[PDB]
Structures are given as C-alpha cells and as structure tokens.
C-alpha cells in the first residue's frame, strides 16, 4: 500500500498477496473511477500463470496447519473479522462508491452482507455437525465427519465486491480450506483491503492468497486451467453462463463440483388482484437497483391482462422519476455508471437487437451524453458511462426476453391468468430468482410450485435476498450448489464415514445381520368371530 | 383368548400380558358394545397394584437385552408389524366398530394411523441421529448419542384405541425402551390384539406388558403411584387435563417429563371472505367426527359479523342432515354412540349449564330415545347411549365456551374482524388445535402467528392431523412434549455427550483454548484518502 | 418376457422398457453365464441413440404427474417394493448367481441392500425436510423446499446388479424424478426383473425406462451424449475413473453435478499391536470377496515392520485355503468367475506389469485351467474365466501399487510406524475406502484424521459398508456426491428458497433492517473500584 493523490481519494499501488508476502510482479493495470475517468483508484499487476501456480502451492503448504486448527478457533478468527468489518464499514462504503459506482445506501448494504456472513460462520465453528448412527451389528458404532477439501480457487465479479466474495471466502476458511482468490479487475482496492482485514483478524499467512488480473486470456483463465494440474480441490465462480459452462467442464473432468452463480432472466408477475403501487415499486427497484447490474435483476415484468394498461402507465410514471448520476457527488440517485465497458457495450447492443426483432421501445435513448441528456441526471455524463433508464414491450421467445442484459433495462409482457404467467415465466434459459405480486393464496401457491427457480418472492422484489437463505439458480443459472447458511457447507467439505468395530470377529452387513423372525399368525377373524 | 358366542361376534375372555405369560388374576370387568348393550365384547381382569409392580419388573428385566438389540433390527421388528397391521386392517376395523362405536370409515383411518406410524419408525431404526462436534481443543473429539430411558408407563384413552397407543408404543420400543401399558377399559380387546400383533412381529416377551383395569381408584391410578417407587423412567398419558396435572405433579417430583396429551377447546374461525360451503363442511366435520369425541374436536366456531346469519343458516341446514345410528348395522352414519357412560353424563350436564348461564340452544334435545326420537336416527336408540347433534350460540367467558365437552355439541360465536377473532380464539384455557377459513394471505398469516395453539389449519378442519407432523398442545392442552415424526424422539431418549481425549495432557476448555489475537489495525481512511 | 430352455434355467429374450411398452429394437446381444459359457441367460437388444432419446422424452412426459404425486404416496410405492423384493429375494439370489457369478451368500446380501434401501426411502416420503427460517424483517416469513431435478440418467456396473442400482433408482423416484436407466450388459435379466418389480409395486409407466446396451461406442455413450440435448437434469454413474472424468466433463458444461462412484485402491493397515488373526481374516475377505471385483476391494495391505513376517506367513496360509469354483454347483466357495472378459484381460496383464517393474510374486499362477489347475478348485475351470488367488510384495510408486485391478489380487507392503502407514496409505490416486487394524486409541485416531478417504474402517474390512451411511470417495474415486441415507438427497433435489411478504411495503434486507444501537457504557472499573 503506497500512495499518490487523486481527486476523490488517494491512488493506491499494490501487488499480489502470496504466502503473506506482497508481490508487485507483472504488467501494471489500472482501475478508473467509473463515475469520473480522471480519477485513478488503483494501479496493480497482472499475475502470470506461474505466479498463480506459486500461490496455489503456498495455499497447499498452509493447509496442514490451518485444517488442524480447531474449528472453534477458526470461528474466533471470523469473529475478529466481524468486529473489524463493523469498524471499517463507513470507509469500505465510501471506497465502494468510488471504485464500482454503487450508491452509498447500496454499498453499505453490500458490506453488511459480509458482516452478516462473518457472524453466521463465526458461530458455525462450534457446529459443522456430522452424525452418530446406530450400526446394524452389535459391538459396532458408525460416524460421519465433515472434512475440508483442500485448496479452493475463487473468481468473483465486481458488482458485489465485498458481499459475494464473502459468501465464498468465509465458509471456505471456516471449514478448514485454504484459498487462491482472483478478484475482479473492477474492484482491486476493495479486494486488497478485504484480504488485509482477514490478516488483521488473525488469518495465518498463506490461507488466503490474492492474485490480481483480468479474466479471458489473463489470470482468470490461467487459474481455471490450473485445475488440470491438480492444484485445486474446489472452484467457485460468479459471472456469465458461457464462462460458467467452460469452468463446469474443466472442473468436471478434474472430478470437482464447482460453485457456479451464473446470472438470470428473472420474472416478476403482477396479477390482476395485486396491490398496484407496491408491485410498481417492487418492479422498479428490481429493475434499477445497481443500475440493473445484479444477477437477480428483473428481466421481465409479466402483467395480467386486466391491469396491463394501468400498470404500464404507473410504471412509466415511476421510471421517469428515476434519478441517475455520480453517486459520490449526488448520493440521492438511484443508480450511477456502468461498472465496466464490457457491460456498457452489451447494453448498447440490446437497443439494436430489440429494434431488429420488433420490440417496442417505450422509454430510453441509450447512453446519456451532453448531446443526448437525461432530464434527471445529476453530474457530468461525459466523465463516465451512464445509461438512460430503458423500458420495452416484448413478445416471449425473443432475444430481449430470453437473454440476460446487465444495465438499466426492463421488459413489460402481457399475460392472461395464472397458468400463462407461470408458463411465460418459465420460458427462459434461466432460473435464478422470481417474484409474484398477488393477494390470492391460491395464485401464490401455484406460482411457488410451478416456477422453476432457485428463489421466489411473494409480494417482494426479485432482488434483496436475505443472507441466511440458500442462494443459487437452476437451469442456466447454476449447477445445484447453494451459497450462504447451512447449505453452503456441502460446497467446502466432504463426508467421511467411519465404522468402529469392537466385536472381536468379522461380521458382515446384509449377510450376518441378526434380523428377528415372526411368530405364527393367529386367525383373528375366527377368534373374534369377526 | 377363549370364546363364547355373542350376536355381533365372539365374547372374548383374556388376562394381563406380563413377561410373555397371560395372567387371569383380579375381579372380572366387562366391556359392552356401546351400540347394543346386549352384546358383550370382552371379559377381563382388573390388575392390582402388585401385578403392575410385577409388570414393571418384567419390563426392567427385559430392558438390558432389548436396549442392546441394534436399532436397525428393532426397526425390522416394526417393519414386520407394518405387514401384520396391513393384513389385519379389515378385522381390526370391524372389531373397533363393535368395541368403541366408531364408523368403519373412521375405524379404518384409526388403524391406518398406526400403520403410518409403524412405517415411519421402522425406517427410523437406521437414523436416530446424534452429532459429531468439533472440539475447541487439538487432539480431542466430541460426540452426542441418543440413549433409551428405561421402562415407560403408558395410559391411553379409548376414542383412538389403535392410533394413539401406536404413537407411544412404537417409538418407545424403537428407541430401545420397554413398556408397561394400561389401556382403556373401553377398548380391552383391541388392546389385547394389538399387543399380540407386536408379539407376532417378533417383539421379545417382557418388552411390552399389558395390565388391564380402570383409572381412578383402579389400575390407572396404581400405575401413576408407582412413579414414586422408581419403577418408571418415563410416563405418557392421554386424557383429561385434571388427571394430567396430577400425573404432571407425580412425575415432576420423580424427575420425569411425562408426555401429556390433554384435550382442548378448539377454535375454528370463518372470515367474511371464506368459501362458505367449504367452511360449513369443515366446521360440521370438526364438530361431529367421532360424535365430537376427539381432543381435537371443534369447541367454538367464531364467525365474522358480515356472514354470521348466512353461515348459521347453512350450518344448521348441514347439521340437520347428520345421520346418527348403530354403525355396525348402518355404516353410512356420521356418528354412533358415546364411547362410555362418563362422557354421556358430562354431555347431559352441559345442556343444564348452558341454559343456566344464558346460552341459546339452536338445535338438540339431549339423549335420543323412543320417547325423544331423532328424525335421522337409524337403529334402536335404547340399545345404547346416543346424543342429538347439538348447536348453541354463546358469549365468550362462559362455561360452554371455555370448557371441553366430549360429544356431539358445538357453539357459534359472532366476532368482528381478524383482531377480535384471534383474541376470542385465545380466550380459553386450552391450545391444542385451531383453524381459520379465509382466502386473504394477510388474515391467515395474522391468525397463524397470533393464535396460541400447538396445531393450526388454514382452510381445513381442526381434526385430521397427518401422522408425520408434531402433535401436541400448549396451555392446558399439554406440557411441551410432541408426538409423531422426528419430534417424539425427545420423549423416549436422553442425550449422552462424550468427549474423547488424545492430547496426552490435561487441557482446560475456556482457559487453555488457543484463541488467535488480532494484528495491529491499519488506518484505512488515511491510506485510502477516504 | 419369453422363454427357451437352457441348462441352469430358461434363456430369456426381452426388449427395452420405454413408457410402459416393451420394445424389441436393435442388434441382439447375449449374456452368457460366466461360470459356464454354454448356458445362455438372456438375449436382448442394443438401444440406439434415437431410442434413448425416445426413452428420455417418455420420462420427461411422465415427470409432471409423478412429481405432483405426494411424496408420502411415492413412498407407499417403495413400501410395496420392499414387500415384493422380500418375496422375490430367494429367486433374485439364484438368478444373480447364474447371471454374474456371485456366491449365494453374497448375492442374498446384494438383494438385501436393495430391500434396506427401499425401506429407508419408503419412510423418507414423510420426511424430505426443508426449513422454516426467521426473516430479519417484520411481517415476513422465509422457507426452503426440496424440489426434484427432472429426468435422471443412470448407468450401472454389473458387479452389484441389484444393490448399486437401488442406491440410485430408489431415491431418484422417491424425490419426484423420472429415470432412464442403462444397466450393465453383464446383468440384463436382473435389471429387467427389477424394473418389473417396480412396475408391480405400482410405479407409473414412464417413471422408470430401461434401455439395454453396452458402454463406449454403444448405448452408454449415447446416453451421456444426450446431456448435451437437455434431456437429462441429472446423471449417475458407477464404473472406471477414466469414463467418469469424461462424464464429469459433459455434465460439467451442461451445469449438472453427476453422481460418480469411480473405484479405488483401498489401503488396509495392520499395526504391530493388532489382533493378527482378525486382521488376517479382514485382509483376506477385503481382497477376495466377489473375487476382488468391488470398487472397495483391498488394493494394498500395509503391514507394520515388527509383525511383517508373521502376518505374511499367516496371510499366505489363509489365502492357500481359499475355495474357488462354480458357485451354482459349489455354493461353499469364496469366489467364482470374472464377471466379463474385459476384467479378466486386465487382470491377466497385471502379472506382466508386475514382473516388468520388479514386484515379487508370492502366490498365483494366472488363469486356472485343467492344464494349470488350482488345488482347491471345484468345478470345470475351462467353462469360464477364473483366476488364481494372487499375492505380491511391491514398492510404493509402482503401477501394481497405484492402479486399480479388478480380480483376485493383493499386495503386501512393509511400513514402519503410524506416520509412514498414513503416508503410504495416501500414496495413490484414489480415496474411496480404507481400514486400520489396531487396539491403540491414538493410532486409530491418527489414521482416521490423517487418511484421505470417503470411508474408513477401524478393525473391520475395506468392504461391507452398511446401507445407511454415506458412500463415496475423494480424489480419483469421486467428485463430492454421496449415496445412501439422508446424504443422497442432495444428489436428486435442488433447494427452492421462498420469502413471503406481509408488511405491505418494500423493505430492503441489509439496509432497512431495524438493528438496535447500544446504550452508553458504564465505567465498571471505577464503579466497582477494582
């Protein structure tokens, strides 16, 4: 951590964290403040594949001591981290606004998710329950224990730069594993600091190693490839489905079950009996929280025929009122810039794909500029990449309907009755989150058991999962793993079954078992006289 | 089992089952067919306190071998019992119609509950899970095991002569305990036969001992008193609150937690938006199943002001259509006789208590006789004790409102809105079952978290719990125990915590624990430049 | 389902089972009795990829009705299957001796494992527990449910033709999935019959579809490939690591977590303080049960220096006494033929690999023939492929030490003390089963926490897992999934998190949460004066 003054804070320069050492090796990258490109947040190196290799070997060297550290002591380290995150929450909030362009409200929420996670798993150090199981043989006892896997490879996005890494890092080390972490190039400073807070909390050197870099053709890819060298016993990834399937494949052949959170096209249904203003507010927040840059963001609002026109009218009213701007200078805004150029580009393209397939554009004029200004913009739109709130009407089966698009866009879709709403809600390659606004018990029930989704909200947004429920998707949104709560323990441990014999002889299950035979049946119809 | 021909079947004569032996000792009692007093079902002896003592000592002698029988083998015995109950279900159904006056439909249901219970616990023999727990010390392992208690004393009523004993007998023996069982004098034959089916399934002699007799001033009381001699490690009772509190007390001072299912005054709410015919049908069945002789039977129907008159009109219509009669000769009837004279007497008395406190009688003329006939009676009303379906309107705070009355009676009570419905529903000394009929998500939610009851039904009767949910009441309905499913394991086992040391030294929890200390905190506001 | 007389039973001819229909389509294969190749057990077709496609689509068409069948009713179907398997156990035992060459002792054990599994999961239909979870918000409730995946593709080996398919088939249908099953061409009749017993038990047509054929370049491969067409939501496989990695890869990219049981090289340690005769008997049975044709078979006996010579002497004595022969004509034999020619061939080659790398052959002369007879052979050794019991001494690091070889072979390896035994035990690509014979608490403990294995036995064989513990390996033996007991539910279900809102407002977790702030701290040192 060395300095040099920028305009919204110091420009930091730092290296990889490998075996406790800081390592400034590789071509320098930089992260610019997405709200103001003049402000340079960090300068950091790109780890080459040899350095990721070295990091995996430090992690391997650290595993023996860490796995033998009693789980309750490892949990005390996480408790130290709860206190330290609490202390640092205002500072991490402000750094997150500068580095990834989130609002202070949402940035604090993001940090809070990590605190919540750290408290849950601090206590989990005195749990991690296995089972005692009765043998079918005399003088024999059966047991199960949860054991750590080894070295975990972790790759994380930058839209939730503290929360979502915490879901992986914290349970991974709690359960006795060591970690190599390749964080997003969109949030290197936050990632560096987080790793230093784990260090402050007492995590031994080499249990967490941090290698900075890009993804495709860079450190991200190098690290996935190292699964073929046996240097990882586990892998976790948050990002695109397409990258996910590739990581699925590599891990697959190396007999690893990766944790894959892969995005979504999240349906939000509004039935004719819904509380309109509540549903409008829920649809709006589902679409525009984080400027539509969440895996869980609303993809399609499916609106019941009899309220379509009224809902549309009220929803456009609500969207028109959205404040957009530089969240450092204007904290009251709903959303600010795109996190990176990649997402801005895919978002630009969706306007063209929409027009080409016959979608109707109701609201939105693409990138906000001086030449193309937005009536409720606050700040300089040329200092970064900011998008008009965007609303379409679309038919099912179209690319705008089925394909994930990060950024401030949403589709309205007319449906008629509950059976159609469920079928249209399922007509996507995804199955992460979902939502229905209704007051009818029966309609909520049908949606709940008829949707194919990892997560459903009744009269609530598609966004804003609580930290202590299982998080994960079906279909193209993931592969069966769940994060958070007790459910993530399956991701970072394996079952060890033990049978202890005391009988002093070889006795064979299923063959020597001393099953008791019936006695002769009494003819009760005859005895009772029916 | 010796014979002598009655008119609906043989008259049986049998003794107590103690240590495998049949024991015909004590003054003879008899059970008459409640539908036809000319038909004698059984002749059986009253066990004296010395014989209950002897039975507890056989159970104690049998416990060493049975507790050491591997749980999966004990479960195979219950599996044998599933097959045998299945075989015998038509015969047990017909015996139950004759001996306790239930309809064939309800009698089969009763037997099915035992089959369901037997299957659940057969499989539980390979479960009974304890925990493996991580020590806070190195070279140390922690464990929990479920252990059997010892000898269980069980007293059961006769309104569910196969189902409710099965809830106690089956988990008790599965978990490695032995049993002394004092069954209802209203169902001695069913009880004898059930014990013989356990014998057929391979249960060793002395694991189940059966002592017949009465309750107060008889075998029931003798057996409760033996808790003061240390001959029981557990006790379970189904019956009246008043007897329950006394058993609570005796067990209390002997450091036993008894299982006490003690009856109820079960509220059923009908909100203004309810599906009327569904609620009417649910209220009717809640009131008149088993002729109102269930702990779970509806005590009070709380009806929302705007539908009061319409609901009343439709409910009286439905009650008037009830068929009452001899279920042996007329299986289509809803309910038949009272199970015993005691319940008939308390039911007679409620007419007088009602009139005296100002309740309004809407329907019912007390006992059905030739002089006082019921328009939809089928059979001879003088051959047994049968009651007019009975409906009152009552004020809260009255004896008819608060006090349990077995038999075919029910109260209507006008309430206005959800808050009042909840408060009036709670205005009873009981808290067993409960029900609300509504379509509004919010009203169901409020009732569900606002009621004080062990069990709640949304758009369903107060009766008809499924066999694999926890069954039990709060307030005067019980003391915290639950029967059925995984929840009953707490009733028949105790936790044994074991710590195994390998460290070769004395190391002290909370004092020697190797907790890790923080490193120095970095001033991040200053380093980042905020 | 039609006949033609062989010599040890009828020669059956049958087709695939697709949507209830029997379908005789594809080039005919045959299965010969491995103990006597003159006896033809079955003639059956090779399903082409289009027919597997058709089978997967029947399964998809059947899933709507089956998944909506209440879990307790699906469990009643399995209960029917428990009774039917019990009835058929003597017949299935005899068919299994004829079709795959196992001893009657082991064949009965195999069938029993399916009965055990069927009872466990029959009961599980009233369990399948999800969670209720407290919200951090007022007027909000959280829930988790277990949901079925869809259509399951299953490929099974023939060494455990009833037991190991039951581990997959039974939980898969219990949890609401439908199945396409490609059984081993070494046990088509057993597979056909088992499917017909599910049909007898009331399983609806199309919930289980059976497609016969081979593996690589045949039906096995066709079925793995269909994961790329979306026709399977899950896959389970028992066989070789090499095939497993490929299935890992295909499933990987299709975001599926396959269940992969992939074989092993199972260490059995004998410490200087062991009960010698007990360890000798455990090593012997671990090596030669099923003629060494189990994933769990002993690969290496690691013997502590001070007892090496004595153990070797006693072990060779014990091996010399092994009866080998035709189990149909001589049921008292320990093991009979190889299941198929493939395994015999790999086993023949291991003699050459051993000689070439310097292993010392202590016992064994390859294939038992009339020209090369075995002193304790019973029957005609030319009528099938039978192997001399085979014992080597080997160094760690060699092919005979590290590589799995199905068949009657075992290695002795000298180790010195517990640390070396653990290191040598881990020096293999595998981690399925493991075992140590010792009396010393501390040595058992060290092995238990030092071994890398899914399963460990203390003073018991590497073989003979009980049906109700989690079964599965680490390293090259699997990918994290476990079968049997509660642990297999993660394989055939996904978590559905539901949040229900009642607050009538949009309230944001992590941001609106009503956390309470501390009061000012009292200065207790000053107040107390200490």
Author numbering:
A (entry chain A), B (entry chain A), C (entry chain B): 1 to 530
Give the original sentences from the paper that presented this experimental model.
Found in both prokaryotes and eukaryotes, aldehyde dehydrogenases (ALDH) (EC 1.2.1.3) constitute a large family of NAD(P)-dependent enzymes with molecular weights of 50–60 kDa. ALDHTt contains an unusually extended C-terminal arm forming novel interactions with the N-terminus in the quaternary structure which interacts closely with the substrate entry tunnel.
The recombinant wild type crystals yielded a structure with a product molecule, propanoic acid, in monomer A and B. The product is ~6 Å from the catalytic thiol, which is in the attacking conformation, while the Glu261 can be observed in the “In” conformation in monomer B. Interestingly, the ligand, situated inside the aldehyde anchor loop within hydrogen bonding distance to Arg294, Thr296, Gly464 and Ala465, is observed in two different orientations. In monomer B, the carboxyl group of the propanoic acid is oriented toward the catalytic cysteine and is coordinated by hydrogen bonds with Arg294, Thr296 and Gly464. However, in monomer A the carboxyl group of the product is now oriented toward the aldehyde anchor loop and coordinated by the same residues as in monomer B in addition to Ala465 and Thr462 through a water-mediated hydrogen bond. Indeed, in the full-length recombinant protein Glu261 is observed in the “In” conformation, which may be indicative of an intermediate state depicting the molecule leaving the tunnel after catalysis, with repositioning of the glutamic acid. The different orientations of the product in monomers A and B is likely to provide snapshots of product handling throughout the aldehyde anchor loop. It is worthy to note that a similar product orientation was previously observed with ALDH1A336.
